[PDB]
From Swiss-Prot, chain B:
Domain notes: The leucine-rich repeat (LRR) domain may be involved in autoinhibition in the absence of activating signal, possibly through intramolecular interaction with the NACHT domain.
Subcellular location(s) of the protein: Cytoplasm, Cytosol; Cytoplasm; Nucleus
UPA: annotated segments: 138-279
Record site: Cleavage: F137, S138
Residues marked Trigger for autolytic processing (site): H111
Domain FIIND: 4-279
Subunit details: Interacts (via LRR repeats) with BCL2 and BCL2L1 (via the loop between motifs BH4 and BH3). Interacts with NOD2; this interaction is enhanced in the presence of muramyl dipeptide (MDP) and increases IL1B release. Interacts with EIF2AK2/PKR; this interaction requires EIF2AK2 activity, is accompanied by EIF2AK2 autophosphorylation and promotes inflammasome assembly in response to danger-associated signals. Interacts with MEFV; this interaction targets Nlrp1a to degradation by autophagy, hence preventing excessive IL1B- and IL18-mediated inflammation.
Chain coiled-coil ranges: none
Family: Belongs to the NLRP family.
Organism encoding this protein: Rattus norvegicus (Rat)
Gene it is expressed from: Nlrp1a
Span list, region ZU5: 4-137
Record-given protein name: NACHT, LRR and PYD domains-containing protein 1 allele 2
Function per UniProt: Acts as the sensor component of the Nlrp1a inflammasome, which mediates inflammasome activation in response to various pathogen-associated signals, leading to subsequent pyroptosis. Inflammasomes are supramolecular complexes that assemble in the cytosol in response to pathogens and other damage-associated signals and play critical roles in innate immunity and inflammation.
């Protein structure tokens, strides 16, 4: 009755994988990136907008800056497919042979950029100035405003310098586009573009070129912040110039003296040398942080006359105790305040704080002069904790925050805020708060209480509500139009499997209006004028397409402006030759909880049959595997698995994202113990609904959390899973960083019971005695989850005698990048199932 | 014939510039003409100087992301005339339809501009062309959706080209197998000419071949054959096209060149070439 | 935490250009392995024409090769290859253009020329050079 997979040779498997990748259907390899819309005067030509973005038009394997003219009065019956015009004439932006310096390659690994060339850029609208980093250094060009829009590509101008290392993180000053800033050799620098002069404002890094001896850093994000909170900057420009022209820059200075150091092999294997990282493991000490200003004054010709740098009149750690992280920070649009978001250590109390620039005084070591600065501060200057969010599960960190430029109402301060711990779901709120003052005496030090600078709420109006949530992470934002009192956002109001665009009046919280067509998942970006928007969407059965829409309608009622399809920038492909799109389903558990999923039913199926199955699994938080998007290019190996006769079952059990807090809050302090029961419950269900599932031959397979879950299944459910192929697993939980483990697992001092039963390396005696029931894969250069985790597991297997197999990827970090390591990963994957399942 | 075929009489087709194949003919009256060498058809109401020019798809496509969703379906022409001169135009396309395997709605006509490209729907699809009423003079060609370069194995009314070189009691054969396009044929003939490789005409495959399908070239007389398996794929006339080199060195009057599918070993095309048929 | 992304790679088309020069009876061949493009041929044609070299048309590889592969140039022993390997990779047009030269005294009955995959030993190309092409 059963069905036995065909046996192939090793070269045969290599050939079928090479063929399945050749038949991919000529993917674009990149969709148009972040856009910018620039209006044009109508008398200048037939077009009305110019649209700038990033992409690779299949020509080169190099992401590049492109633009397109948005026509005027396009005719309806015929589809218009906009061009992709080059903007930099024959300028390659990847380094020679595609090898990056260690700083920028580590940053690319932190951002997961798998493309070469210009990855991001900074753009000043008024001057129309483009500034970016390409090859090994900074470049800039001008197309927008006074220069007049271009027709032919033009040459980018290299910014000459005298620094040694690489110039990181360029940022154009909004108040004046003649200057910019950057990070060099772990310190901060400000430079001019016209006069070519530079200046250094921070003196923290010795430059001794040894991570061990120079721990301090200024205006740069540490590791745990980059990885587990997704903030890739440490400096921020003040958007207004104060009156000589004075400019401000808020930045942070980190002190990593007491952070534990570890060694990681380097991409140069022959040297047999390692690189050291400040890696704070769970329970250890995080670095010391602080916030500092850095003024600088210029004259009419653009010369930096003075350049000071100030600090809080009290030690940062004194005004704000129980503060472990700086999630986000920035200014308001008038320049009257600088704000930041503080997280405590258990990650259960986030709070917005508002800081006036007047609280920053120059660094005066002479105690006599310092007591003069602490005397000259105005009375109404003090920190303002506008908002505080306390939960019982954990605080997910949002970027969504939009303060309104206040008129001469000295008491009030109104802003939107996507709060999530109030109802259990991420919803927008319009909150107005009165900035109460106390007229502190900064000369005498103060030990702040729990409610020192907390200002009382005047109103708190929910704008959205229901059993759904507003997209707030992974680069999702909101667009607020203050001429019509609206707010555009993205959420899952329709169904948890789709991302749609919405709009609602933030003055009167009326009815929400969807702006995208149902049946797809949309990733869209508005215009700054709120008349056009581009949407990138797809579905399970359709590859992505990128259309541009134009909001038309009567000007008196702006809420109901109808979205008109204007033009297209990319069409679907449908991947016809060998791709059967999976089928989404959903079931209930015995605890009455709805879960979703998908199944790749085997090709060439026959009734009264049974196929070997492969329960693909990630299971970890902040990841949703089942949604109505095109999985055809991301996970196509699962289609190849199905093409041979395997039945792939994906299931997003309790713990995943996009379903609220109380749903995700099932992992708290029980990580590992609960996610498998949802996988086996959702695997036995498919045995009822469908009949081709052979529960005798059940595999399991994951990566970096599913690798951890692959091992937990084989321990807890040895009779359900025959084999188990773990990938870059997390074996011991006491050797992972603070930003992630403490969020969910509550440092071992408190959860030593759960750390024991969650670490899979401490239960090695329950693994199978029989051979050929465990494969292990890990990358050698991995710095996210180090090779130690696999290395310590193998050590525990030998102390008990259990068999295993192992595959190491020497030139691969946490993500398989080169194709030869990708092919060899899949070729060896099929071969294990072919023989031992 | 190369001249436009009309009821009154074939109009003399004068070439302006052979380095770009600029032709220009005078429609002497109203009515409906056609040219088979290009596969074009025209329906006009006056006597008008029409200007026909060839141009490669690639140089207009280098900016647009078209080529990953719609596949090139025919030769891309360039038409010039007065506005109220041409009523109907019929653009050729090599896509096979006779079995109805592919739908008759997925076709489109290209209309290039500085903005981008406009993708019109033909007024009528026919087993060898697409109809367009009242055209706006631009570079125009036929497009087919579904990116069938690897998918849908859409039938292609392909053709086969044979080129030869004698060189003192020897013979060497260049065998091209391409989609049906006048631009590709012309580019191949040009590039072969500067090598003294002259063409010889032979009936094409009378069946609908498939995209990306392998085709083993062989013969009865055992000779030298360089690429055993050709492909049936599309590549712009400005590039170089695959073919097969055959050192036939004929010692017998009839050499039966032949090609065979690789998937099902079915025989498709055969042609026996004799001496004397050359110069 | 995000699931690691396996990279996607597609092979590309390519051509192989054969050039020759005859001094008295010795032949110097110039073999070019280059991705199939337009500008590169009409550039390399002039670059070789400067040194009185000329082209000889031979079919390109049918298979789609990956960018970054290495290929052993093999023949029958009567040839001399100063570079024994070729490399398929994009190249800036205004910059230098790599090739492999071959020295042979007298061709006579024609010489074989083969490219072979370094990693798997695949015969992905061939050419039976004869004096007729000269």
């Amino acid at each position: 009755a059963r069905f036995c997979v065909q046996k192939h040779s090793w070269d045969g498997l290599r050939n079928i994988i090479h063929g399945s990748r050749k038949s991919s259907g000529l993917i674009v390899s990149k969709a148009p990136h972040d856009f910018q819309f620039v209006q044009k005067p109508d008398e200048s030509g037939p077009h009305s907008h110019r649209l700038y973005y990033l992409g690779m038009p299949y020509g080169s394997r190099e992401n590049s800056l492109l633009y397109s003219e948005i026509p005027k009065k396009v005719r309806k019956e015929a589809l218009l497919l906009l061009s992709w015009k080059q903007m930099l004439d024959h300028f390659q932006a990847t380094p020679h042979h595609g090898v990056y310096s260690r700083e920028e390659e580590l940053l690319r690994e932190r951002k997961r950029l798998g493309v070469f060339g210009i990855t991001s850029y900074d753009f000043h609208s008024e001057s129309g100035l483009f500034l970016f980093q390409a090859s090994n250094s900074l470049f800039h060009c001008r197309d927008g405003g006074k220069n007049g829009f271009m027709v032919s590509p033009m040459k980018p101008l290299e910014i000459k310098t005298q620094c040694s290392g690489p110039r990181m993180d360029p940022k154009i000053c909004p108040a004046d586009p003649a200057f910019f800033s950057f990070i060099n050799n772990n310190d901060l620098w400000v430079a001019n573009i016209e006069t070519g002069e530079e200046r250094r404002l921070t003196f923290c890094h010795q430059g001794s070129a040894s991570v061990l001896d120079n721990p301090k850093s200024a205006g740069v994000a540490t590791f745990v912040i980059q990885e587990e909170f997704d903030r890739f900057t440490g400096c921020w420009w003040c958007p207004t110039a104060s009156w000589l022209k004075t400019l401000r820059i808020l930045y942070e200075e980190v002190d990593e003296s007491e952070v534990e150091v570890i060694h990681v092999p380097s991409p140069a294997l022959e040297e047999r040398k390692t690189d050291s990282y400040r890696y704070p493991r769970t329970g250890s000490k995080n670095p010391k942080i602080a916030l500092k200003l850095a003024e600088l004054q210029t004259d009419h010709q653009g010369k930096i006359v003075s350049s000071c740098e100030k600090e809080l009149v009290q030690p940062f750690s004194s005004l704000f105790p129980k503060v472990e992280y700086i999630a986000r920070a920035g200014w308001t649009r008038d320049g009257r305040y600088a704000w930041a978001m503080f997280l405590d250590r258990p990650q259960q109390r986030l709070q917005l704080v508002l800081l006036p620039p007047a609280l920053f005084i120059p660094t005066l070591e002479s105690e006599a002069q310092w007591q003069e600065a602490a005397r000259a501060i105005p009375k109404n200057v003090q920190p303002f904790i506008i908002y505080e969010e306390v939960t019982n599960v954990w605080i997910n960190v949002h970027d969504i925050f939009h303060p309104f430029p206040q008129a001469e109402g000295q008491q009030d301060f109104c802003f939107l805020r996507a709060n999530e711990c109030k109802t259990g779901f991420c919803h927008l709120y319009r909150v107005t708060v009165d900035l109460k003052t106390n007229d502190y005496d900064w000369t005498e030090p103060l030990s702040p209480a729990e409610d020192e600078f907390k200002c009382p709420i005047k109103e708190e109006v929910a704008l959205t509500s229901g059993e759904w949530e507003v997209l707030s992470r992974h680069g999702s934002k909101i667009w607020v139009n203050e001429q019509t009192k609206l707010v555009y956002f993205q959420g899952t109001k329709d169904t948890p499997l789709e991302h749609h665009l919405y709009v609602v009046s933030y003055e009167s919280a009326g009815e929400i209006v969807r702006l995208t067509t149902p049946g797809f998942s949309h990733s869209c970006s508005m215009s700054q004028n709120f008349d056009m928007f581009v949407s990138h969407y797809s579905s399970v059965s359709t590859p992505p397409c990128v259309h541009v829409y134009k909001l038309s309608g009567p000007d008196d009622d702006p809420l109901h402006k109808q979205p008109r399809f204007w033009a297209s920038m990319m069409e679907a492909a449908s991947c016809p030759p060998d791709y059967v799109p999976p089928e989404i389903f959903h079931f209930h558990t015995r605890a009455d909880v709805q879960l979703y999923g998908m199944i790749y039913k085997p090709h060439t199926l026959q009734p009264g049959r049974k196929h070997p199955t492969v329960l693909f699994v990630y299971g970890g938080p902040q990841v949703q595997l089942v949604n109505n998007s095109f999985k055809g290019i991301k996970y196509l190996r699962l289609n190849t698995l199905a093409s041979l006769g395997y039945a792939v079952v994906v299931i997003d059990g309790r713990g995943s994202c996009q379903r609220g807090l109380h749903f995700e809050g099932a992992l708290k302090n029980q990580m590992g113990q609960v996610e498998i029961e949802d996988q086996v419950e959702g695997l036995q269900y498919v045995a009822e609904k469908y009949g081709f599932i052979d529960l005798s031959r059940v595999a399991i397979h994951g990566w970096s959390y599913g690798g951890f879950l692959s091992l937990m299944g084989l321990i807890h459910k040895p009779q359900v899973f025959k084999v188990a192929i773990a990938g870059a697993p997390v074996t011991v939980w006491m050797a992972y960083d603070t930003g992630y483990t403490e969020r969910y697992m509550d440092v071992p001092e408190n959860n030593q019971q759960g750390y024991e039963a969650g670490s899979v390396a401490l239960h090695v005696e329950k693994l199978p005695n029989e051979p050929n029931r465990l494969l292990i894969l890990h990358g050698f250069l991995d710095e996210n989850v180090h090779f130690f985790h696999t290395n310590f597991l193998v050590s525990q297997l030998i102390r008990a005698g259990k068999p295993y197999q192992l595959q190491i990827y020497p030139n691969e970090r946490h993500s398989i990048r080169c194709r030869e390591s990708g092919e060899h990963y899949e070729v060896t994957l099929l071969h294990f199932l072919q023989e031992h399942l | 014939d190369d001249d436009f075929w009309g009821p009154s009489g074939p109009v003399s087709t004068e070439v302006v510039d052979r380095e770009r194949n600029l032709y220009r003919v005078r429609l002497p009256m109203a009515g409906s003409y056609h040219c088979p060498s290009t596969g074009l058809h025209f329906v006009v109401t006056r006597a008008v100087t029409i200007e026909i020019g060839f141009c490669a798809w690639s140089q207009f496509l280098h900016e647009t992301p078209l080529q990953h969703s719609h596949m090139v379906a025919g030769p891309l022409f360039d038409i010039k005339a007065e506005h109220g001169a041409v009523t109907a135009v019929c653009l050729p396309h090599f896509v096979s339809l006779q079995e109805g395997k592919v739908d008759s709605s997925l076709f489109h006509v290209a209309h290039f501009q500085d903005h981008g490209m406009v993708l019109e729907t033909p007024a009528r699809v026919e087993p060898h062309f697409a109809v367009l009423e009242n055209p706006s003079f631009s570079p125009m060609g036929v497009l087919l959706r579904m990116i069938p370069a690897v998918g849908h194995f859409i039938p292609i009314t392909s053709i086969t080209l044979i080129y030869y070189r004698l060189y003192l009691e020897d013979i060497t054969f260049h065998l091209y197998l391409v989609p049906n396009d006048c631009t590709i044929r012309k580019a191949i003939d040009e590039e072969e000419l500067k090598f003294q490789f002259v063409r010889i005409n032979k009936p094409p495959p009378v069946d609908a071949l498939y995209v990306g399908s392998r085709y083993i070239v062989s013969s009865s007389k055992e000779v030298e054959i360089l690429p055993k398996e050709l492909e049936l794929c599309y590549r712009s006339p400005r590039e170089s096209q695959l073919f097969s080199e055959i050192y036939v060195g004929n010692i017998g009057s009839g050499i039966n060149l032949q090609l065979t599918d690789k998937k099902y070993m079915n025989l498709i095309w055969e042609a026996l070439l004799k001496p004397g048929d050359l110069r």
